[model samples]
Target: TVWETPGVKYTLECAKICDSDARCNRLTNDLPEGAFISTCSFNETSYRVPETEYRICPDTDYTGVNAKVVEGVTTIQACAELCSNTQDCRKSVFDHINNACAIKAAEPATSIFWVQDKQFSTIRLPENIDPAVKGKWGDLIRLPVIPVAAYIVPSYPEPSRLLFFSSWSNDAFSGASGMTQFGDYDFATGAISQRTVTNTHHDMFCPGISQLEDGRILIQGGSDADTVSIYDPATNEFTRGPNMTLARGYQTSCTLSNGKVFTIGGAFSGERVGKNGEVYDPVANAWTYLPGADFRPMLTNDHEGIWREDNHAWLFGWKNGSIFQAGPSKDQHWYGIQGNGTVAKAATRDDDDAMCGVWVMYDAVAGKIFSAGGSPDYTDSPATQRAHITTIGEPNTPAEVERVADMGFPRGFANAVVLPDGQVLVTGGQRMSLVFTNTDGILVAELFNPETREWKQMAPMAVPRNYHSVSILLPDATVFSGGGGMCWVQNVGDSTAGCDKTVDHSDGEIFEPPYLFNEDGSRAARPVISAISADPIKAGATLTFTVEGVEGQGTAALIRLGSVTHSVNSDQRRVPLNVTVSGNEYSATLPDDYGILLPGYYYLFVSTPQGTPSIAKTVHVIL
Candidate 1:
């Protein structure tokens, strides 16, 4: 039968309507929309029409399983290639940790459903593997959740941990109250707490944190606040630190190798906003003013700091600026980090400074200092300015290298943290363009692996936010992102049409980056004594080992034993499974169907989550 839609076929709506219509049967190829066509004779109506490719079409040639295990120095690309080259392999999965690539003849890696007779293959790499791309892999695994977050620069005696500001409450900034303690919280899980000195203060808003040698957390100036608050994390208590010499908001705090905490410039209390800066010393517990230290700084918003050799803590600010070491190593001065017009010197209505936000000083591969993402221009009309990327040294050397790369995330006040493998994880912020746009009103995370010199996507935070966010690297190589404002709308009654609302507002989430166990630190005691291998039986034999005796966090990184001949890699995402344990002893066996008629190697690993995981034992057999 022939039929035509009432509207033109080329019309956008008509195309969708045709796809949706149920009664409209086959139409003549030449009939246009809105044109009437009568049904053909009964015999003619039964005739078939021309058809194009459908999902049922068999385009692929490969099918069924091939070899059981292929061993090599496992790399991501090699594993992919081995799967692609195999003839009988319909799909494949590779384990980079063991250098083992499993070539599957079935179990569709290249999955598609319309027809059962058709076949295809998919090559699987280690599931849940996070790649290190572009520039030292700075953007590694991100925190699984999103929370109102602030940075905590750790001092000599302080172990650094991120300071979350609010209820991990689901998005929309739900349950936010200026008077409640829930607004300021540690990274751990719990309810919205009472405002305490260790977390956020009763009056403080949109703050950054730093830990002092004496165990006091210095809550720096935030939006709408005049001074600083000091909290003891051990007691969840706080007290007023010395008032800032200059009142400011959106400021940053950092701990130097010399045990000094410096509060960088940001939006100031009054005219000229922020240009001068100040430093806080735990020994003195007092704020010391630095009259005029702006030596070519770019836009300063939420700045980040990291301690390097010579007591110099590299500082990265907004607006494509650079902070170099001047003065003596002991007494340092930051140089050459200025802004373009209206960006660095953005004019506040005589009440605020034209400062911007978001800065991070990170070490990629020792000696190289890199900073990415921050508003480039003024807050009043910031769309003109945007976020940027730049680098300092090769191995933290004095010479600066100018590498310009765009941050994968939004620019207005986003967060960045150091990953275990020396990458940086970046997340949510505003995307103020010519029109005010909360580009990151939703949670999205990106990883910058210096080794690959590119960016890769990781799981997003639970909430969307603009300012008031934080990211930190955990001891386990997992990154945590937290807190901030809810889905916001700017320029409501103006030229812009629609308001912005994110998928999440106040809700938060946590992310676990894919990282190998490192054993360099405290994992020295649990070393692998002797490589254990079971006697090979018939093809359908069983194997078992025990591993319940291991103790402590990240302790699993200690010992390892698996295949000796062919490599067998553990799927990190699905690891900590496959093995049954009793009192540090573990055991698991292969299916009876595996290797009954063939000869091959099977590999398995037993190790702690610490650094330098031990080797795995291997077993080879012939049917």
Candidate 2:
């Protein structure tokens, strides 16, 4: 093979220019300690390498996206971090020729940088950055600059995590359903929109977006039924790949660490599902049946499931009473709850009846799976069941604390989104009931803080949902909830009924967290209204006062006023004591009956936690 290098002439020129630039005066790293560049000059010839071969950018273990050049960034080190934080950046490299970052697998030649100002950088391939190629789908447009908000920053950027989702109900779920299309969102700008891709199929459900090895977007296992689609933002269109073995709806897809998507467990056989799963090979455009389909045992039964870390895909309730994890090769071999709240090492065989609830493995390292509201038993169903969700920590796992705090609400098919900062946002699900009311319609949501093992109430979803729901994590740092139950009914005069019909229209909305602070600075009390007490007055009258709970060392104080009289600690009860006023300083008017109301002496008194009582004081009553 004939090969060429940058040549000593150009090498000296590029390095000279690189150093002369005031902005390039020095290169500093911002990654955590021990973190090295994964993929820089390692494969590129123009990148200067030492005869001794030191592991810098080109040789580092960091497999970040390879792009030409990122705007406002001078070195490849800075750009690599961008890829690391952006959900799908693998390895970014700058082109030696055209001077742009050429993202692998990207079509119409996708790039990290737009070298409109060629003086800064050029593309390695001229055809990739050619004006004609840039205009194939649409003209080259600079991304709108958005100012970062202080509240959104919170001292750290959004976590380097991404969630994958796919859609298929174009007729039942379309633009109106909001289940179609995909794009990344910028949390800081509060903008919720996606740019169209060239040759991309719109109006499909669960478009299942994944980022390739070099930052290119992969659109696979969509409503196209059997076909997988890949979209290139640089080209703004889609390229079809191998078809899935089983045509599926609401396909749940996840990108494994090795850059392969394991699409599995969708609505197989209409609504009634089975423990069937499939895998797609992007490079080969071929499908293979996951082994042990019938060998292991019955495992999952649900749509819109989720794929977790490692080579595992976890199905929530209705899939299995206990959560299960399956893989591309080991399909029939399913791992379920091993009694200790974690997946058992051995596979267990069971019938469809064994499946009841769903579970998502949130933290792979901790092996803590977040099981949304589910029942231990769904068979031999009970009329009334508890809807409390359990966070089953890893079994025999060593941790400071391994416990589950009641989420305080019961739900199923509800959507749970884990934010970058380790907070879980739970929304939408159907509450089991006879005259079924939409549990998804409840406009209440809560935030579960793993650190405190407590739940804090947050703003609820804009709409109620149930039956079928999908939570899509966008590139822009916002989560989109699409399609579920959003329908109404009409009334009939006499003996009439609104037959049970599943709501198919998709109602999409974005989720944003409340004001967040660092662990060290987040200790603040939540405002609360303590207590109200009343005092008994003469016949038809009453004296009322309010009391606030105060915490003190070796002592406490209780104040009461204007409301119902109740026992403070069973020792004493409050009653309305009448007081008579005398101008500015009101005194209790002494009653002749039993010296009940006494002027000036009719002051309110309270006992302290120290058992010390304070003398009553006369005050002017405005009312």
Backbone collisions counted per model:
112, 81
lDDT of 2 by residue, 1-623 (tens): 21223311111444566534423422222221222111232234332222211122231221122433344555544443444444433334433333234333232122121211112222122222221111111111111211000001101112122212222211122221222333333434534344333243432333333343222344444335455665443454467666666655444444332334444444422232432455444556565555332312333332223221111133321122222242211121332222312232322222221122223333332334443343222212211112222223332222121335655455544555554334466655444411123422333556676666677655444344344444533323244454443222232112213433223322245553442212233312211122223222342233333223223211111111110000000000112333332222222332222111111102243222322222222221110
Tens-digit lDDT string for candidate 1 (309-348): 1111223221122233311111223432123111122211
The prediction achieving the highest lDDT against the true structure is 1
TM-score, cand. 1 vs. native: 0.46
Over all chains combined, what TM-score does candidate 2 have?
0.40
Distance from true location, Cα of 590 in model 1, Å: 45
Q: Give candidate 1's root-mean-square deviation (CA, Å).
A: 20.9
State which candidate has the highest TM-score: 1
TM-score of each prediction: 0.46, 0.40
